Amino acid sequence: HMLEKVVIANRGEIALRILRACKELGIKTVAVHSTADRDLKHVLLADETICIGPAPSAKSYLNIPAIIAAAEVTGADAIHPGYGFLSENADFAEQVERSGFTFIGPTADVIRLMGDKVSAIKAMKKAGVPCVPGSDGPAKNKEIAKRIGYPIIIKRVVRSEDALEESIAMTKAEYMEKYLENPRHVEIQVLADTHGNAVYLAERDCSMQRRHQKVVEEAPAPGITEEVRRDIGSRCANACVEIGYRGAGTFEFLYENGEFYFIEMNTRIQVEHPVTEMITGVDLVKEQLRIAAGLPISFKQEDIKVKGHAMECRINAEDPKTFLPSPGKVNHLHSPGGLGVRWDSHVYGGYTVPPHYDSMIAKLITYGDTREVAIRRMQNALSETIIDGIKTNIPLHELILEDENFQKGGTNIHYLEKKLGM
Amino acid sequence: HMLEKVVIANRGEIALRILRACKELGIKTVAVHSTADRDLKHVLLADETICIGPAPSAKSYLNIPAIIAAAEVTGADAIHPGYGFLSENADFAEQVERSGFTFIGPTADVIRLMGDKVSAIKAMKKAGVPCVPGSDGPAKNKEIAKRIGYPIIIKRVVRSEDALEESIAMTKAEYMEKYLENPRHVEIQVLADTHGNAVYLAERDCSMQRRHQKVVEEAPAPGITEEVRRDIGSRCANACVEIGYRGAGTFEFLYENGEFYFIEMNTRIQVEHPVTEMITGVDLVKEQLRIAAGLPISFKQEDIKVKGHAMECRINAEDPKTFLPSPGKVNHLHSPGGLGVRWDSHVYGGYTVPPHYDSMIAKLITYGDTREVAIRRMQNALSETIIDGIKTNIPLHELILEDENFQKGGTNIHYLEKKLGM
Ligand SMILES: Nc1ncnc2c1ncn2[C@@H]1O[C@H](COP(=O)(O)OP(=O)(O)O)[C@@H](O)[C@H]1O
Ligand SMILES: Nc1ncnc2c1ncn2[C@@H]1O[C@H](COP(=O)(O)OP(=O)(O)O)[C@@H](O)[C@H]1O
Ligand SMILES: COC(=O)CCCC[C@@H]1SC[C@H]2[C@@H]1NC(=O)N2C(=O)OC
Ligand SMILES: COC(=O)CCCC[C@@H]1SC[C@H]2[C@@H]1NC(=O)N2C(=O)OC
Incomplete structure (x- = not known):
């Protein structure tokens, strides 16, 4: 009726960090891993392991349905996503x-x-x-840019009023703020x-x-x-x-x-x-x-x-x-x-x-x-x-x-x- | 005119510990070592190394004159003895x-x-x-032992008055205190x-x-x-x-x-x-x-x-x-x-x-x-x-x-x- 088992939906050092915290709290761990990561430290320490796909990220660590099935098949309570990936x-x-x-x-x-x-x-x-001061959202931009004050970042960085409308259009086949x-x-x-x-x-x-x-x-x-x-x-x-x-x-x-x-x-x-x-x-x-x-x-x-x-x-x-x-x-x-x-x-x-x-x-x-x-x-x-x-x-x-x-x-x-x- | 170089008159982990403190303070280190210890981590990290004798302790880490000559030859200010040895x-x-x-x-x-x-x-x-209560230094020992109170440690441990004089003589071809x-x-x-x-x-x-x-x-x-x-x-x-x-x-x-x-x-x-x-x-x-x-x-x-x-x-x-x-x-x-x-x-x-x-x-x-x-x-x-x-x-x-x-x-x-x- 609490968190008893956690799928670690990540790899490498942060997966080990998470494993360590889990084990301190007595929380069971599920290491989901790609075929290239069977020899990761945290996989080797984990209570249960489930291979969720081949080496590429797209097919493994970003595989939303395989990661959710891994939680399902193990009877896990929670998923820790680490940083990066999902x-x-x-x-x-x-x-x-x-x-x-x-x-x-x-x-x-x-x-x-x-x-x-x-x-x-x-x-x-x-x-x-x-x-950072800016336009808040979204001609009148010469003046918006005016009061925000140059230099400006459309995101280009923009140092001249001359070239506002340009850098407006240039980023605009690709908001304003104080740079x-x-x-x-x-x-x-x-x-x-x-x-x-x-x-x-x-x-x-x-x-x-x-x-x-x-x-x-x-x-x-x-x-x-x-x-x-x-x-x-x-x-x-x-x-x-x-x-x-x-x-x-x-x-x-x-x-x-x-x-x-x-x-x-x-x-x-x-x-x-x-x-x-x-x-x-x-x-x-x-x-x-x-x-x-x-x-x-x-x-x-x-x-x-x-x-x-x-x-x-x-x-x-x-x-x-x-x-x-x-x-x-x-x-x-x-x-x-x-x-x-x-x-x-x-x-x-x-x-x-x-x-x-x-x-x-x-x-x-x-x-x-x-x-x-x-x-x-x-x-x-x-x-x-x-x-x-x-x-x-x-x-x-x-x-x-x-x-x-x-x-x-x-x-x-x-x-x-x-x-x-x- | 201060401590600038220290001979580490020890080995193993405490020699490394000492090396680490020295290096934090910018103090030069002299690793004195036996022939069996040339591959110690702290010897390898040390600024200067001096082999002070063959493997046995007696001839190396307990070699008072070789350790003092090592300080002399390097121009060291101080010697850290660690624990154990000297x-x-x-x-x-x-x-x-x-x-x-x-x-x-x-x-x-x-x-x-x-x-x-x-x-x-x-x-x-x-x-x-x-x-610990005892005789403080040094017949009348039946009574010294009396008031300290059994059990007693001559150092034997001694649970009976019967056998005081024995355990007195037994340790005494080889002071009293509360055990x-x-x-x-x-x-x-x-x-x-x-x-x-x-x-x-x-x-x-x-x-x-x-x-x-x-x-x-x-x-x-x-x-x-x-x-x-x-x-x-x-x-x-x-x-x-x-x-x-x-x-x-x-x-x-x-x-x-x-x-x-x-x-x-x-x-x-x-x-x-x-x-x-x-x-x-x-x-x-x-x-x-x-x-x-x-x-x-x-x-x-x-x-x-x-x-x-x-x-x-x-x-x-x-x-x-x-x-x-x-x-x-x-x-x-x-x-x-x-x-x-x-x-x-x-x-x-x-x-x-x-x-x-x-x-x-x-x-x-x-x-x-x-x-x-x-x-x-x-x-x-x-x-x-x-x-x-x-x-x-x-x-x-x-x-x-x-x-x-x-x-x-x-x-x-x-x-x-x-x-x-x-
Ligand atoms: N107002 C600003 N002034 C100067 N540099 C900025 C400003 N806003 C964004 N940047 C630069 O662009 C970087 C991009 O932001 P960031 O949050 O790192 O994007 P992501 O997180 O997707 O990589 C910022 O760290 C900063 O260096
Ligand atoms: N009053 C006492 N009661 C019980 N045990 C004692 C007493 N005094 C000494 N001992 C035992 O003998 C041990 C020997 O002392 P220690 O300082 O370890 O000798 P060394 O440091 O030379 O090895 C003590 O830790 C203790 O276990
Ligand atoms: C082994 O692969 C992983 O476990 C994920 C790789 C790292 C994600 C990046 S590193 C800098 C950035 C991302 N995560 C993170 O926290 N960063 C951080 O400093 O916050 C921006
Ligand atoms: C590699 O050899 C050395 O660096 C010295 C060996 C250890 C000396 C002993 S261990 C327990 C005792 C001695 N030193 C120490 O501090 N001990 C400690 O706990 O205080 C009694």
Whole structure:
């Protein structure tokens, strides 16, 4: 009569993370996997396994009917979608609850609401979560653009009135907003339950990115005071209640000259959740599972106090210079350890990284009482880490961590790409 | 003009632990090693290496003149002795400071004081650290034994007056005290610096033992209240000042029917220090190094608050049934991870555990907000851990953790051996 068995509708490290939380709560696990993933750590640990299709994503991890049949055939109570794949797919969520299983995440209606940009802004704007100034929806655009103020983003970026009508038409065989020139990425973690509670769990800075993909994340964000945290955090907790949010989620902002501007709500657990765990002492995947089971969040807002600092390096099987993937056999893995070092990875000596999915192989997470200690622990853990047989982006991480502007802190979302050009 | 280079006068996991702290502080390392240990993780990471002798302990890690020459030839500032080997050897400490290097630990005089039992009791007794009732030093023994009260320990244990004089003479070709029948082992961690400060860092319960060797340790100790902690802890901090203690140390007690009875001060870092780290947020090996450099302890007593619970399983290369050592090649090591899991080990896939030293190969440390969470995390981390090629005592740990009396908590120092007999 509660959650007793959970289908893990994902793979790789987050599938292992979920398995770990399940096993801590005594929840039975069902590992659904493609034919290429029979040797995943979490498949090998799972109570039951069901092969849901051949290697390609389309035919396996995105196979909505096979994943639902796997829940049916095992007698499962709930499905955890992880991140990526179907986690923000409303049709999947809708179909999961229509077949009577618990979807571990928000309701389908809320996924669609926060899954479309204009709709999401409206809803934030009404909740009093600050958005980027814009036209709100939808000749008079010379003037709309006027008052928003150049530069403008139709999405092109647009620096001249001359060329408004062009960039209007150019994106328009392919809405307007203030283009923020050099913002950081600062995001707020929340949880909301079926007992009407919602909390905020400080913030993460994920400004170090390449091609919009995050490389290094940290928590808390440098420069953000407790006062400021409280303001923005409590606006997000409130937004959660207004929209009947449920489960873990993240409000992503562009943050520039002291102000927050909303850009997306990821309605799911994120890759970078561990850094918030380390600074708050909250188990975010456990709380997902509890909340899905109908439990209240296990603590109150005044129980949450940011303590110390945490960093995460996404370790990828890829050439550190060209960023082309590097699948193949890991002959040896020597993973780092010691105080303040956490290692979240499904990779082991003997394991073959397949070509079929993303290239993330491990997340290396460090914690310290200060940002400087956490960066130093990261540097030392990276130098101890050996992954023999394939190439990784460890060398990129080492360059970032020794960057003087990174050490000062507060570098913007373009920094990595500039650095890399220089 | 400070500590810039440290000789790590030890091996195995604690040598790696020390290396890690050194590297966090930017302190150069000198790995002194025997010929059998050239492939130790910490030797491979060290800035400088010096081979101090052939495989046997006697000729290498206990070679006082070779270790001192290694400090001389490298231009080192200090020597960290770890635990075991020379760490409680006053002659070594005396000779290290007489050759002008900093010994990372207390002064030689203090090692001898707390290194001999009668002397240590005197000094504790004068400090107001509670000792076990006894004769204090040294016919009239029928009566001394009388008032201490049977049962008695000459060290034999002695249950009858009849047989006092015998057991007197029997141990006396080979002092008296109350024999505590079913105590737990509860120990208090301290630090003391050259600025006149001394602190206590709660306590550990290390009652699960076999042949007097510890298997599982935890912190805090079940049943001990904050009130009680404060009392006993502050008596140990005070004892530290009275004796001019310096560095990390531990006061070990036998704890029975609500009372603490002193049995030894280990004047060094201990194997089981990590569990205290996890519950207090203190880096105990860093503080050793700071304190040795002449710095104050980096926090005050009121900054220390016990939060959560931690467990440590000493993973040994040994047959889990006969406890005979199992040296040889580890073909694969798959180490556990995830939230609340810490792994302290110099072992890696490819590494050969030699026969020459102890059988400890890794310490698996878990943390949780409650004792139950920490035990469950331990169980799950052990089930994920693979060490292929040699035998380990993991099966023993799994049996302990599933023991109902262990789960209730507070089992005594004889429990494991009884359990094992049953
Ligand atoms: N107002 C803005 N100013 C500057 N850059 C923006 C703005 N809005 C969006 N962008 C850029 O485009 C990116 C695309 O948004 P994102 O949520 O990452 O899309 P997706 O989540 O589908 O990849 C943003 O991170 C940001 O870097
Ligand atoms: N008063 C006592 N009552 C019961 N057992 C004792 C008492 N004193 C010592 N012992 C036993 O003998 C052990 C030997 O002490 P210990 O400090 O371990 O010696 P070493 O450190 O040299 O191995 C103690 O842990 C304890 O189990
Ligand atoms: C093995 O394949 C998987 O388990 C899914 C692959 C990762 C999905 C991407 S990574 C960056 C982005 C997506 N998920 C996520 O949380 N991200 C995150 O930072 O939020 C944007
Ligand atoms: C690889 O060899 C070494 O690094 C030294 C071996 C261990 C010394 C023993 S284990 C239990 C005891 C000794 N050190 C220690 O701290 N112990 C501890 O619990 O305090 C009694």
